[PDB]
Amino acid sequence: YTAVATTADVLSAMGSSTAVSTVTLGSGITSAAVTFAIATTDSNNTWVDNK
Amino acid sequence: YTAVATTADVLSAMGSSTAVSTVTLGSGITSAAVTFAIATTDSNNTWVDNK
């Protein structure tokens, strides 16, 4: 009743891959990265805030 | 030399259909509209500024 409560859930409502492309294309000042390979061949791709 | 010049071109830089989906999905406070049918079925769709 002093600090606001949190009811975090795994919604996955943003699940669509095309939707993720939309949000990562028109994002603000961001530094989003992708891990897309297994640990023996893993990598991270870091791109522009909004491109 | 006083009024700025204009060199507008047909860019089609957002030619990809998903690119237009991104710009109409991540748009600001807009009123973007779509006409998607011919004169005998012509209409217009108006939707939320960013949804």
Side-chain angles (χ1 to χ4, degrees), chain B:
Chain B
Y1 303 170
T2 66
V4 176
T6 303
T7 67
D9 196 331
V10 176
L11 268 297
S12 167
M14 272 275 198
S16 177
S17 179
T18 187
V20 172
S21 169
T22 56
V23 65
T24 190
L25 270 166
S27 82
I29 313 305
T30 81
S31 312
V34 166
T35 285
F36 64 92
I38 203 162
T40 50
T41 56
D42 192 354
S43 53
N44 189 359
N45 286 356
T46 181
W47 60 88
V48 176
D49 65 288
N50 47 349
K51 308 322 295 173

Side-chain angles (χ1 to χ4, degrees), chain A residues 2-32:
Chain A
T2 82
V4 186
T6 298
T7 57
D9 191 329
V10 173
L11 277 296
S12 158
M14 188 66 203
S16 177
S17 185
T18 77
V20 177
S21 197
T22 62
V23 63
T24 199
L25 269 180
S27 75
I29 313 301
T30 66
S31 59

